[PDB]
Design a protein around this ligand. Structure first.
Ligand code: SAH
Ligand code: SAH
Lengths: 341, 341
């Protein structure tokens, strides 16, 4: 039946409702002061009455809000997010979709046809990857990492629960960004020490992330190019978090070989990101999130299958290669290998 | 729970997958030559293999396609559209979303906050309505009406099944666009004669629609401004198809009172468009489609509730006012009235 096509055919509109609910302060208002009538919403949020009605209709029909009494409350997924302490995280990733993902997504068809990340044209600069363009605009880098920080807060529980971090001590965070994951690791495991490797632009945000955690003595930054520069020696654990999704399989092989050469024998390699199921049918998250990867970061970015990643670890020379999957939310998992002695 | 938020959070990406499947010719390919391997798709569609994989994961995960065999076929909603002869309709409304709706949708938050159709900025010009701006870009007016045509072909069976058309003979099509509905009515009812009222630019497309149905002697075009000019006298029936959703309630009143003055006493008024449920909870189609009306056509545009429409008819002076809401056809219906003798 073709009624089924309506939510896809209007998917962008569906997103815009969540976008508006967040940006316009609806969900937080309902959280602190619900239930509220449409006219109370309009007055609170300073919206024209027609505007509140349209918004409330949008969020109510999607299940983001519920209406009884002619009074409005947050719906179950929203209320759930508040309950679990995940609202600022949810709010921030929505901002990201809005400010970073949405408009480049329009270049999806061209990006597929030409194999280019055509969506990057919306950002000043001439380099062919998104990250080296973040520096081109004042405050852009900070906005981007506010986003990434939040995505990792959402997905790094599976990382933090990784058995290896009770057994390793010195982690190399390759492309560690704003050091969100270094810090989360350092906090959960006081034994641990982490080197955050990234572009200088990222590391300026990293220092601030490190400084407000007071983790300057166990978490440090090091500026390098992940391809052309050497990975710092004397590390126990090489971590790739939301990294290998950016590059082609051959580039990934290159990165993993550097991980191998640099890591202490008996050490571990960890690949942490979303993964496409090996049967290529999902999950929905990877399937959808790939529109971002096809249009923006780099021309070969895509969410790879577990089996493909595992293959790269073995062909880099790692052993004991395997995966850690379920939490629930999402396809985030860890693929891991050991450097043999 | 927040897994639920995923299709909304990536709502724009879901649409883009559908968008790509249409534009790149995937669904048509699968229809005539499925089942196919990923690599067969890649070669046929002239896509890089990595592109074919990313696309196929998206459509498969969405159910737009299915994978068994390791061979790909159209999923149920897509195949159903082909079987029912609705494929070109689906194709054209997807093209309309892509070229007309998707980017102005980003101006939703701003549109809500200011009560303006802020999305109109994506179109060259300075007038306050979308329709008078279409001529500024070559082929835009026709591309637009190609889009309107396809939407009406999808929803006007409820209109064609409206009982009044066995009791009326001369219908006035107020804001009749490319005459998709005038022609469809004339076909369904050989008794009928229709006057299509619209801007000259629209009527140029209307003439063509009329000519290729060969209905030039029963369906004619008349250039007028629906607000500042009088409606032609001597009509049995005044029809508003996808029209009142554009204007404010005060404006809808002005238009309906004009219909009142122009229609023969004992004549009928028909308002045909999508409707919002009186309980303001849905349907989803109306709730989402509002993103387009808030951002693009005009500063007051919105999908009104049945009851609000009914109320305007009665206050314009019509009697016997009621609704027709065929099951399966939601959110499309007709609100109708009579001019008293
Ligand atoms: N050539 C390069 N040298 C250094 N860092 C690079 C790089 N190419 C990409 N990166 C970094 O790779 C990161 C991708 S985003 C992931 C950031 C962080 N690990 C997290 O999980 O939240 C960005 O910080 C980008 O600056
Ligand atoms: N001031 C005006 N005068 C005449 N036509 C107008 C108008 N403002 C809007 N319209 C027309 O209103 C229509 C809105 S779209 C509806 C088209 C047609 N009724 C259909 O159902 O397919 C457009 O054709 C637009 O040109």
């Amino acid at each position: 039946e073709l009624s089924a096509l309506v939510p896809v055919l209007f998917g962008h509109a569906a997103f815009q409702q969540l976008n508006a609910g967040c940006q316009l302060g609806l969900f937080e208002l309902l959280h602190e002061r619900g239930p509220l009538s449409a006219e109370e919403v309009a007055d609170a949020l300073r919206l024209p009455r027609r505007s509140a009605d349209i918004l409330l209709l949008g969020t109510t029909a999607l299940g983001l809000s519920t209406v009884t009494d002619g009074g409005y409350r947050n719906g179950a997924p929203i209320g759930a997010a508040f309950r679990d302490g995940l609202w600022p995280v949810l709010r921030d990733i929505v901002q990201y979709q809005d400010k970073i993902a949405y408009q480049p997504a329009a270049d999806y068809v061209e990006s597929l046809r030409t194999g280019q990340n055509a969506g990057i044209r919306h950002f000043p600069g001439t380099t062919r990857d998104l990250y080296s363009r973040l520096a081109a605009v004042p405050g852009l880098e900070e906005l981007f990492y506010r986003g990434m920080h939040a995505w990792s807060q959402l997905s790094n529980p599976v990382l933090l629960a990784q058995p290896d971090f009770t057994r390793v001590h010195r982690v190399l965070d390759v492309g560690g960004g704003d050091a969100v994951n270094a810090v989360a690791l350092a906090r959960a495991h006081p034994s641990l020490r982490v080197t955050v490797l990234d572009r200088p632009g990222a590391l300026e945000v990293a220092r601030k992330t490190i400084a407000e955690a007071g983790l300057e003595e166990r978490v440090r930054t090091h500026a390098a190019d992940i391809f052309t520069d050497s990975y710092p020696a004397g590390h126990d654990c090489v971590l790739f978090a939301h990294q290998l999704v950016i590059w082609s399989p051959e580039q990934n092989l290159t990165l993993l070989r550097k991980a191998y050469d640099a890591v202490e024998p008996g050490g571990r390699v960890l690949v942490f990101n979303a993964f496409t199921d090996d049967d290529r049918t999902g999950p929905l998250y990877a399937a959808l999130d790939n529109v971002y990867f096809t249009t923006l970061p780099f021309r070969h970015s895509t969410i790879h299958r577990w089996a493909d990643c595992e293959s790269w670890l073995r062909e880099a020379g790692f052993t004991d290669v395997g995966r850690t999957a379920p939490p629930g939310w999402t396809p985030h998992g860890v693929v891991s290998g050991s450097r043999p002695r």
